[PDB]
Design brief:
The structure is cut from a larger assembly and holds three copies of chain A (about 50 residues).
Chain A: H1 16-20, H2 32-50
Chain lengths: ~50, ~50, ~50
């Protein structure tokens, strides 16, 4: 007989850092979270390949 | 509004004295990216299917 | 990865030794029927309009 294993995981972004963070050099009108989620979206794909 | 024994004294001009600034808040999403808006907002929550 | 003073010794075939198997998970429904999928999934939950 043979039966598989399960593994999953999650990540959440709260309300402050969605609208409060920009770049560190210039002034930004709040669009860096869309940059930062898409990396974190790519990172969880690397988690499952690592597992 | 102006109290009874009081008056204001406007100095060198009678134009717009200052500025009122609306800043950004969080709206919904468009293509998985967080969308932002300024000024007042009105959010609608139709939970017309709950128990 | 293969350590310093160590090696691995294959046997009768140099082909794939085994198999990695994905099993079915619950994806979303399509027409009231639960639709399934296999392999790594990645789900997005936007609660960008709540309290």
């Amino acid at each position: 007989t043979w039966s598989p294993l399960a593994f999953k995981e999650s990540r959440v972004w709260d309300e402050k850092e969605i609208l409060y963070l920009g770049r560190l050099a210039d002034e930004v009108q709040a669009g860096v979270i869309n940059e930062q989620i898409a990396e974190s979206l790519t990172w969880l794909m690397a988690r499952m390949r690592n597992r | 509004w102006i109290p009874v024994g009081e008056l204001i004294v406007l100095n060198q001009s009678t134009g717009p004295v200052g500025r009122f600034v609306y800043t950004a808040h969080v709206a919904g999403q468009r293509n998985g990216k967080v969308v932002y808006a300024t000024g007042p907002y009105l959010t609608v929550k139709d939970h017309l299917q709950d128990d």
